[PDB]
Amino acid sequence: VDPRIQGELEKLNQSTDDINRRETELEDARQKFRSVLVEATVKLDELVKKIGKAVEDSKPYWEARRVARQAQLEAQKATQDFQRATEVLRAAKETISLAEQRLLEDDKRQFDSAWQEMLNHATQRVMEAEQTKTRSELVHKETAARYNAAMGRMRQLEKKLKRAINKSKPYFELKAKYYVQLEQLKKTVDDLQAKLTLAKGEYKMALKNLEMISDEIHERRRSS
Amino acid sequence: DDEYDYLFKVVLIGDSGVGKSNLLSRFTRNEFNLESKSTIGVEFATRSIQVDGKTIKAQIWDTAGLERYRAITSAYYRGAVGALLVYDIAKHLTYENVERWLKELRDHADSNIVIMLVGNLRHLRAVPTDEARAFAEKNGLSFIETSALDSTNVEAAFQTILTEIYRIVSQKQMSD
16 A cells, blocks of 8 residues: 655645745845845945044054954953963872972972982872963963053054044944844844755655655565 | 755646656656656656746646545645646546546645646647637636647746746735
């Protein structure tokens, strides 16, 4: 008679409607993205026309502010890494032998690697924890210096371009807003695209197991 | 290659003695490698065109003419937006059973689908073209007859029914 045909058929003509629905939603999302981008460009352009040339030559300042924020974030991450490195160090020192502790701390003049053969073997993990800690402190101070450089730079550029920056604030503020909205709508478009592709995948799969049923009937009829 | 804008379901119905598979085989890219009518009961085949700037991918569900054990007709007609009722211009029994197949459509398909009646060298005129044309006119259906050597009007038929379906769905979308 017939086995599993009806269920996969129903799944197929359901995945049709699912595909059409997801596609319509995706196209509406694309349209909203387009109209928002157009509106953004024309509004920003007219704001440039009514604000003047301050926006253009005040552009290096806002760039210096961007690199300053990045140097800040990178500095924070490096400070975190330093902290966790330090806790690893002290937790390693919890292997006590307090005499050996200040043997490492008091002077690394001539550690003489042959002493490790004579004392606790758990000094190696302590010592390499000290190494990773000292390097993490290096990157910590380095990124701190980068942050201070970017900060002072953006401030002297600020005092060089004070009038232009204050006159150009609304353009860059509105442009920021439009950019946020654009990335949100683009996220929506991408997610709807993924839903659509998944629906088409379900369709293709139901079709594939349907012709799988047909092929299983092929060899069954081939037995003769 | 799944890049398209709409997906429309079109069913192929009518009397079995018309041989729809050979007019289909010219334009349809069968998705399976073996006959799906004797095994599954329906033979799928997909065709894509372009209408009004958008891409229309329509999948054709073929036959189920051996309806001796086809309790799958509920799923076979569900969701379909297009229907092709194919009869032979050399047989009158097919043209008489067109009413029966229309009953099957009204019983199992949606009440807003686009239906088109299609009429398919040695035999001479059994169905007058004007009679079938007036029949499709009184029943609110499209109509185009075509043979297998000059298959222009079947392509124009596909583009016609698909274009009408796109018109319906676009008019539905323009009322949001």
